[PDB]
A = this chain, B = another copy of it.
Amino acid sequence: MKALILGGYGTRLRPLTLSTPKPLVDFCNKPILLHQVEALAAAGVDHVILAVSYMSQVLEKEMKAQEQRLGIRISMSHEEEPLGTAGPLALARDLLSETADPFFVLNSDVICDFPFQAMVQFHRHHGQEGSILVTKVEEPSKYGVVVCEADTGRIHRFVEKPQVFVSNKINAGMYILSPAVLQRIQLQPTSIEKEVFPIMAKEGQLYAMELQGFWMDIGQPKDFLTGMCLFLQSLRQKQPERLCSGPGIVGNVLVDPSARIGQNCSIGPNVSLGPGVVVEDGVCIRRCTVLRDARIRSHSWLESCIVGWRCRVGQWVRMENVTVLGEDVIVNDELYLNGASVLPHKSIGESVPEPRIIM
């Protein structure tokens, strides 16, 4: 069977997506697209189509290298206008039509551990058009809810709007679809979840499968940080010898072998250090994500932060409240950043006391 990967300019976490595309940003020393295609190759999908409407030549580049690395083919669906999230299915519809076999369609912003063959089992057990994945959240008033009958998993109704408490369960971003669904899908830029899932739930074709746990949509920067926390938890009780252990290391940290840490510094819990980063002496880093080539100078304090590529955080810099730095941001010595989403190629010489955007 084949699989779609859903293109263009993820508007959230904007200081990272302005430099490289949203599926290409490193999530625990690996791009999220690489995670999804590793799990797809572990499932057994022989080729996977990655729709892209934003002109992404570097995604062509690294993806051709990954075709050559991993042993599965990849087809490149290219759109000149944004066709949304259903229009990518109808552009590549003659490829999914020439084998009558159910195909995955995947969102890129979702990290979890992926029950692909169990969802194939489920789609083979219920035996209709399309199946969804659903998960639990703590906050029903932020996401659209799905009603689910016990022992069947059928979706009676699909609600986009909260505040009614009809359901706990939330869309998880994987769908499994038949080609008859693809007959229904339409080339003009409509999104799939807005109507094509609404008539399919109204007609009752849609069924729902539930995950165990560890789901995150990391389309937002604070959601990126909570997803990185839960991914380091899942790496802790799945691959405990891949996380780095040390005397000045607290909790679960992921450190790349090209990364260097100076001595007498306290790397706190839940932080991924990218390849080639330079941490000097006296730097406390808890709950942050430091992408590639980002040098953090001595005696800094960093909590809940996204440090972009080729950054230079100076000495005695305090950064808290998920301040995202873009690419090549030069933070001067002895500053304080709180909520500062800083655009790429900026130089900061002033403290940012409340959350605002620096451009």
Contacts and interface: CB of A to CB of B under 8 A. Distances in A.
Interface of A: 264, 281-282, 284, 298-299, 301, 303, 315-316, 318, 320, 334, 336, 338, 353
Contact of A282 (B298, B336, B338): B298
A338 B284 CA distance: 21
Nearest to A301: B316
Taken together, the copies of this chain in the complex come to: 2
A282 B301 contact: no
A271 to B, nearest CB: 14
Nearest to A283: B299
Contacts of A303: 334
Contact of A281 (B282, B316, B353): B282
A320 B318 CA distance: 12
A150 B298 CA distance: 57
A334 B299 contact: no
A164 B298 CA distance: 52
Contact of A299 (B284, B320, B338, B353): B284
Contacts of A284: 299, 315-316, 334
A7 B336 CA distance: 42
Given A336-B336, A353-B353, A301 B318 contact: yes
A200 to B, nearest CB: 50
Given A318-B336, A336-B318, A336-B336, A281 B301 contact: no
B264 A334 contact: no
Nearest to A320: B336
A316 B303 CA distance: 11
A337 B301 CA distance: 14
A301 B298 CA distance: 12
13 contacts: A264-B281, A282-B282, A282-B299, A284-B299, A284-B316, A284-B334, A299-B301, A301-B316, A301-B334, A303-B334, A316-B318, A336-B336, A338-B353
A338 B351 CA distance: 13
